[PDB]
Amino acid sequence: MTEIALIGNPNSGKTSLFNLITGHNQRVGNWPGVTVERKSGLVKKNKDLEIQDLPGIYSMSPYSPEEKVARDYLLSQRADSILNVVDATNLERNLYLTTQLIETGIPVTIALNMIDVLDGQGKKINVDKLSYHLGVPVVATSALKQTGVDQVVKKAAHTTTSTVGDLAFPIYDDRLEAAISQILEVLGNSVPQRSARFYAIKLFEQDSLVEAELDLSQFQRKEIEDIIRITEEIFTEDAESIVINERYAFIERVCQMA
Numbered sequence: 659m660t661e662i663a664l665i666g667n668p669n670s671g672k673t674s675l676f677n678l679i680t681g682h683n684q685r686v687g688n689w690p691g692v693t694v695e696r697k698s699g700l701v702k703k704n705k706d707l708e709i710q711d712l713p714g715i716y717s718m719s720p721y722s723p724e725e726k727v728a729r730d731y732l733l734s735q736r737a738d739s740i741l742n743v744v745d746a747t748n749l750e751r752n753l754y755l756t757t758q759l760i761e762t763g764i765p766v767t768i769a770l771n772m773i774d775v776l777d778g779q780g781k782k783i784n785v786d787k788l789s790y791h792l793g794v795p796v797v798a799t800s801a802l803k804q805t806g807v808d809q810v811v812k813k814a815a816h817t818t819t820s821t822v823g824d825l826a827f828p829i830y831d832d833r834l835e836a837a838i839s840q841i842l843e844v845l846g847n848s849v850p851q852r853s854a855r856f857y858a859i860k861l862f863e864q865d866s867l868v869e870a871e872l873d874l875s876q877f878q879r880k881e882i883e884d885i886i887r888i889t890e891e892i893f894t895e896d897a898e899s900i901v902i903n904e905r906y907a908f909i910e911r912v913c914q915m916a
């Protein structure tokens with residue numbers, strides 16, 4: 659019925675949560691022809707929902723096979739929803755992947771895990787103000803104390819590709835936004851409308867996998883090269899770095915509440 663994808667940074671509490679949600683309704687196996695573990699399973703309480711676990715990754719780079727597995731699954735549109743496990747204690751760095759996940763076009767829910775530790779240190783997070791400015795639902799969870807779990811799985815199940823109409827994509831500096839829009843318009847119907855922005859930013863970044871597994875015309879390829887060149891001249895920096903700078907700048911802007 660409903661396909662929810664669990665993903666986040668290594669040691670954010672993925673396995674911990676995954677175990678509490680699925681119980682022993684788990685199946686361990688293979689991603690095709692890749693030396694990467696594949697596990698999935700039914701939600702213990704709502705048996706019509708299935709959770710597909712994804713590799714612990716810091717970002718959708720084209721290098722490690724763990725990230726090719728994650729990129730491919732989330733762009734296959736098999737998942738109805740993305741349940742993002744975020745470490746509360748290292749909130750800033752965790753959101754880096756989050757911004758990339760949102761761009762896939764599959765609705766993202768944040769399980770702000772390890773909320774118990776946050777209290778011990780003294781640091782606080784405004785869950786309401788964070789959620790709104792980030793544009794995604796945020797449910798504080800603790801895999802230790804076992805709080806927020808059922809509340810986040812419920813949120814995830816109701817935040818799907820068939821429920822969500824308006825998807826707030828992280829808006830960056832106008833100069834980069836001009837480029838994304840220029841790449842998008844040129845792409846036309848060559849990319850899935852949902853994943854359009856993911857592919858657009860990946861083409862700007864000059865991503866190996868995206869370019870290779872996309873049959874773009876001579877006209878399209880030339881136009882995308884021009885846009886990249888001029889944007890590099892405007893920012894006086896390479897395309898990969900403009901995007902990295904823009905993600906963190908957005909992350910600090912969102913942390914105007916935290």
Ligand SMILES: Nc1nc2c(ncn2[C@@H]2O[C@H](COP(=O)(O)OP(=O)(O)O)[C@@H](O)[C@H]2O)c(=O)[nH]1
Pocket residue numbers: 667668669670671672673674675714771772773774775799800801802803
């Ligand atoms: N205090 C606290 N610890 C947690 C919580 N969730 C996970 N952990 C701890 O995080 C460590 C790694 O958990 P794990 O699920 O393997 O992280 P993963 O690599 O994302 O799967 C373990 O030692 C857990 O005790 C939590 O909500 N609160």
